Design a protein around this ligand. Structure first.
Ligand code: HEM
Ligand SMILES: O=N[O-]
Ligand SMILES: O=N[O-]
Length: 151
C-alpha cells in the first residue's frame, strides 16, 4: 500500500545508494555481520573474516555487496510489482542459503542504520517512513514464499 509520494521518496533515497553502491553494500554487510554474528556464519564465502578491518579490506565482500544491492534496487524500482524479481531470491534464500526471515529483518535494520550514518541530516523522517514501508513489503512478499516452502 505505498503511495506514489512514498515510492518517490524511496527511489530518491535509493539514488543516494546508487552514487556509491559498493560503499553502501559493504557498510550494510559489515553492520549486519557485527550486529548479528550469526548472519556471517551463513556465508561460507565470508566466514573466514573475523575483524571489521578484515571485512573492510575484502574486495570480494564489496563485490557481493554490489550484487545484493543491485537486486534490491531493481526490486524497489518495480514499486511493488516485483513477483518475477523476488521469486528467485525467495527460492535461493529459503532453500539453498537457508536464511531465516528474521535475518531479513536484521538486513533491513542495517540498511536504515547505514543510510543515517552516510547521510546525516539528509535522510528525512518522511523518507525513513517510506523506506520502512518498502522494506516491509519486500519482507512480507518473501515471507509468503518461505511459508509456501515450509520455511
Ligand atoms: C535485502 C535482502 C537481500 C537481497 C536483496 C539479497 C540478494 C542476494 C543476491 C542477488 C544473491 C546472489 C543470487 C542468489 O543466490 O540468489 C545473494 C546471495 C546470497 N545471499 Fe542474499 N540477499 C539478501 C539478504 C540476505 C541475508 C540477510 C543473508 C544472510 C544472513 C543472505 C545470504 C546470502 C548468501 C549466503 C548468498 C550466496 C553468496 C555466495 O556464496 O556467493 N542474503 N543474495
Ligand atoms: O548480501 N546478501 O546476500
Ligand atoms: O543494524 N541494525 O541497527
Amino acid at each position: 500500500v505505498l503511495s506514489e509520494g512514498e515510492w518517490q521518496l524511496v527511489l530518491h533515497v535509493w539514488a543516494k545508494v546508487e552514487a556509491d553502491v559498493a560503499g553502501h553494500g559493504q557498510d550494510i554487510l559489515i553492520r549486519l555481520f557485527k550486529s548479528h554474528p550469526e548472519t556471517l556464519e551463513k556465508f561460507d564465502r565470508f566466514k573466514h573474516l573475523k575483524t571489521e578491518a578484515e571485512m573492510k579490506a575484502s574486495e570480494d565482500l564489496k563485490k557481493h555487496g554490489v550484487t545484493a544491492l543491485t537486486a534490491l534496487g531493481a526490486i524497489l524500482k518495480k514499486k511493488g510489482h516485483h513477483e518475477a524479481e523476488l521469486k528467485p531470491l525467495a527460492q535461493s534464500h529459503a532453500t539453498k542459503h537457508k536464511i531465516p526471515i528474521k535475518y531479513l529483518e536484521f538486513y533491513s535494520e542495517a540498511i536504515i542504520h547505514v543510510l543515517h550514518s552516510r547521510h546525516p541530516g539528509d535522510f528525512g523522517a518522511d523518507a525513513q517512513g517510506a523506506m520502512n514501508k518498502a522494506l516491509e513489503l519486500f519482507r512480507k512478499d518473501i515471507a509468503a514464499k518461505y511459508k509456501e516452502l515450509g520455511y
